[PDB]
């Protein structure tokens, strides 16, 4: 019960409200022994409402759709994911 955030499939998603360019968000999660969410793990889950528009592990914001836009100059929030237990 020590997950202060979204808990799903034995993993804890912690919200980081600071806007960051993708690389910085990625490194920040790596520093906390975590990774960014994977679009495939969250689509079709109640988590999608929280993670959409936040950095996905593939360098793109997570979206409800399965899109195909220059986003390298953008900043967004992100969730760092870590397995529980």
């Amino acid at each position: 019960e020590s997950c202060n955030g979204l808990y799903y499939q034995g993993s804890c998603y912690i919200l980081h409200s600071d806007y960051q360019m993708f690389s910085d968000a990625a490194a920040n999660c790596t520093a906390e022994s975590s990774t960014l969410p994977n679009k495939s793990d969250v689509m079709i889950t109640w988590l999608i409402d929280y993670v959409e528009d936040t950095w996905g592990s593939d360098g793109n914001p997570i979206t409800k759709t399965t899109s195909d836009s220059d986003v390298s100059q953008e900043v967004r929030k992100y969730f760092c994911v870590k397995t529980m237990n």
Side-chain angles (χ1 to χ4, degrees):
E1 311 71 58
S2 51
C3 172
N4 295 346
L6 315 172
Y7 183 69
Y8 171 73
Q9 303 295 291
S11 282
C12 184
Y13 291 68
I14 302 301
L15 168 64
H16 282 63
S17 61
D18 56 292
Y19 286 87
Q20 299 297 330
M21 302 192 87
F22 175 71
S23 308
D24 300 312
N28 290 6
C29 288
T30 298
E32 300 187 302
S33 302
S34 306
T35 61
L36 289 164
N38 297 308
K39 181 179 181 176
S40 300
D41 292 323
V42 297
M43 290 173 93
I44 321 314
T45 193
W46 60 271
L47 297 174
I48 188 57
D49 302 298
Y50 297 80
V51 305
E52 45 178 348
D53 287 312
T54 71
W55 291 128
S57 58
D58 72 323
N60 292 303
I62 302 292
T63 61
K64 280 190 172 66
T65 179
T66 310
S67 186
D68 184 296
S69 175
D70 192 303
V71 306
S72 57
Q73 291 307 301
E74 318 187 315
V75 293
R76 293 165 180 276
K77 300 180 173 188
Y78 55 97
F79 278 87
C80 289
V81 190
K82 204 171 197 178
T83 304
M84 285 291 266
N85 283 294

